[PDB]
DNA sequence: CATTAGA
DNA sequence: TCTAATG
């Protein structure tokens, strides 16, 4: 956690770089690996030899350890952190929509900067047209001040349109924090859930709601279950307009939300810990459900869920608080 | 690890 | 269809 750190580092760095730049799947895997042994290991890894005892210990990743415990850097590592095409293929996978592979092929074309984005707009699909086009307010984090607002407004609209629809953000926000990055809004209606084969109107209602007073400004994508959109606040009586913001509304089976719900609102540790905790219970628990477990190895058999409370009750635990959810 | 675009 | 990109 601190003792391993740089070794983890740099590995890490070694590894994602394969990765994009690169197209070495293996080796990327092979850094991974490494990177998540090491980092395991209980004690200051004295050496490469030391490290090499490890298991996915390489001898050419000993020898970087080395290099590494030696002098507080790495050549390969300068020489990738130099490197242009690489630097400009980090950056570009910015851009929302862009990745990697998208990156390398713009590289190749010659654009490595966000103004040859621009020149290159036709070359560009509608995603990343977008993602280029709030580029700056998409790197920006959300005030919770504004989350607030957000919601207060989504609950309204969602509301209007069916009284019938639940609608929860989840997340960090949920979660009490500060500031968020994008707003998460789990949604289900009793209409529907796991068998009720479908109503995809029932997310195209809201999302034409939304649009409809124009909080929702542009969408990256729509699907039957699953809208990637764009939000605004409205910009008040002027001088002060707000940031675009990225918006995820997903439909779900009122048979499946807590769970979904459950799990969304993390925190990512917290989920594990109490994964990690059904088990003894006898149990298991996944983005949708809660099965008890037989002994056979395994088991089937969905328990039914009313509420963020039933989860917690069958694998009886305290109730904690969203707030609390941290691990 | 599942959902959407797109080509 | 497969393959990318997002979460
Ligand atoms: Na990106
Ligand atoms: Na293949």
Request: aromatic fraction near 8%; charge should be positive; include cysteine.
């Amino acid at each position: 956690e601190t003792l391993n750190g740089g070794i983890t580092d740099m590995l890490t760095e070694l590894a994602n770089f394969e990765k994009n730049v690169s197209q070495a799947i293996h080796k990327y895997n092979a850094y991974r690996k490494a990177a998540s042994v090491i980092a395991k290991y209980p004690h200051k890894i004295k050496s490469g030899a030391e490290a090499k005892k490890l298991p996915g210990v390489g001898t050419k990743i000993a020898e970087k350890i080395d290099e590494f415990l030696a002098t507080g850097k790495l050549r390969k590592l300068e020489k990738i952190r130099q490197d242009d095409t690489s630097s400009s293929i980090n950056f570009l996978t910015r851009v929302s929509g862009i990745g990697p592979s998208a990156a390398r092929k713009f590289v190749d074309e010659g654009i490595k900067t966000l103004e040859d984005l621009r020149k290159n707009e036709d070359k560009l699909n509608h995603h990343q047209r977008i993602g280029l086009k709030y580029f700056g307010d998409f790197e920006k984090r959300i005030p919770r001040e504004e989350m607030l607002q957000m919601q207060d407004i989504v609950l309204n609209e969602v509301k209007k349109v069916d009284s019938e629809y639940i609608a929860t953000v989840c997340g960090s926000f949920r979660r009490g924090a500060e500031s968020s990055g994008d707003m998460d809004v789990l949604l289900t209606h009793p209409s529907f859930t796991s068998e009720s084969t479908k109503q995809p109107k029932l997310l195209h209602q809201v999302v034409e709601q939304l649009q409809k007073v124009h909080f929702i400004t542009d969408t990256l994508s729509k699907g039957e279950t699953k809208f990637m959109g764009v939000c605004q606040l409205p910009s008040k009586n002027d001088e002060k307009e707000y940031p675009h913001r990225r918006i995820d509304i997903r439909l779900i089976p009122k048979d499946q939300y807590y769970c979904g719900v459950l799990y969304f609102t993390g925190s990512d540790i917290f989920n594990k810990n109490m994964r990690a905790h059904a088990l003894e219970k006898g149990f298991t628990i996944n983005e949708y459900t809660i099965r008890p477990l037989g002994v056979t190895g395994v088991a089937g058999e969905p328990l039914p869920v009313d509420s963020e409370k039933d989860i917690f009750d069958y694998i009886q635990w305290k109730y904690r608080e969203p707030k609390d959810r941290s691990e």
